Amino acid sequence: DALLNQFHDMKTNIDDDVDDILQENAKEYVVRAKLKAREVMNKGYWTGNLSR
DNA sequence: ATGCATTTTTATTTTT
C-alpha cells in the first residue's frame, strides 16, 4: 500500500548507485591496465613511466 | 617503451 515510497527511493538514490559502480569499474580499469602494461612490455627497456 | 640515426673515440692499414 506504501509502494510510492519504494518508487520515490528508486527515483532519488539510483543516480548514486550508478555513479558508484562507474567509479569502481574506472578504478579497476586503471589497476588492470597498470598490470597489463608490464605483462606485455618486456622487451627490456622498462622504466615504467607509462604505468606511472 | 623500443628502436634507429648521427657523432665521437679507437685500432689498424697505409703513406711519407
Which tags fit this structure?
1 chains; 52 residues; DNA-binding
Description:
The chain is mainly α. The chain has one helix and no strands. The longest helix is centred in the middle third of the chain and has 38 residues, at 3-40. The termini are far apart. The structure holds one DNA strand of 16 nucleotides.
Summed up:
The chain is mostly helical and 52 residues long. 73% of the residues lie in helices and 0% in strands.
Order of helices and strands: H
How would a crystallographer describe the biggest sheet?
none
Using the CA coordinates, give the radius of gyration.
20 Å
Helicity, as a percent range: over 70%
| Structural class by SSE content | mainly alpha
Strand proportion, as a percent range, falls in under 5%
What is the number of helices? 1
| Separation, N- and C-terminal Cα atoms | 55 Å
What is the 3D form?
rod-shaped
Instruction: Count the E strands.
Output: 0
